[PDB]
Amino acid sequence: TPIQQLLEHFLRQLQRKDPHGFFAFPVTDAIAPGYSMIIKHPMDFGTMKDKIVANEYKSVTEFKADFKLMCDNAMTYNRPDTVYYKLAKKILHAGFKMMS
């Protein structure tokens, strides 16, 4: 709760970095063939937004590790030459710079 306002600002800042909405909603097997076979713990901005309001983040560290989980997934699923992989590598770095 002393962190909620801060995590909301973090969330907003990070989505501003994904203007296409790539990271907005969970990825499904129909959009991304074999995804649930390859990716064990999915995560997305919309899920993170809910966790914040449900008071599920107990520390900035848990928050950050969701964001990182989300980017590691994308880098793991999508091949290095895609716009998906690249965006994930950029916003991961740029996002951790902002939160650290």
UniProtKB/Swiss-Prot annotation:
Q: What is the lineage of its organism?
A: Eukaryota, Metazoa, Chordata, Craniata, Vertebrata
* Location of the Bromo domain: 1-100
Q: What does this protein do?
A: Plays a role in chromatin remodeling and regulation of transcription. Acts as a chromatin reader that recognizes and binds acylated histones: binds histones that are acetylated and/or butyrylated. Component of SWI/SNF chromatin remodeling subcomplex GBAF that carries out key enzymatic activities, changing chromatin structure by altering DNA-histone contacts within a nucleosome in an ATP-dependent manner. Also orchestrates the RAD51-RAD54 complex formation and thereby plays a role in homologous recombination (HR).
Cleaved signal peptide residues? none
Q: What is known of its domains?
A: The Bromo domain mediates interaction with histones that have acetylated lysine residues at specific positions. Also recognizes and binds histones that are butyrylated.
Q: Where are the transmembrane segments?
A: none
Q: Where is this site: Histone H4K5ac H4K8ac and histone H4K5bu H4K8bu binding?
A: I31, Y84
Q: What is this protein called?
A: Bromodomain-containing protein 9
Q: Where in the cell is it found?
A: Nucleus
Subunit structure, as described in the record: Binds acetylated histones H3 and H4. Binds butyrylated histone H4. Component of the multiprotein chromatin-remodeling subcomplex SWI/SNF called GBAF, which includes at least BICRA or BICRAL (mutually exclusive), BRD9, SS18, the core BAF subunits, SMARCA2/BRM, SMARCA4/BRG1/BAF190A, ACTL6A/BAF53, SMARCC1/BAF155, and SMARCD1/BAF60A. Interacts (via N-terminal bromodomain) with acetylated RAD54. Interacts (via C-terminus) with RAD51.
Q: Where is this region: Histone H4K5ac H4K8ac and histone H4K5bu H4K8bu binding?
A: 76-78
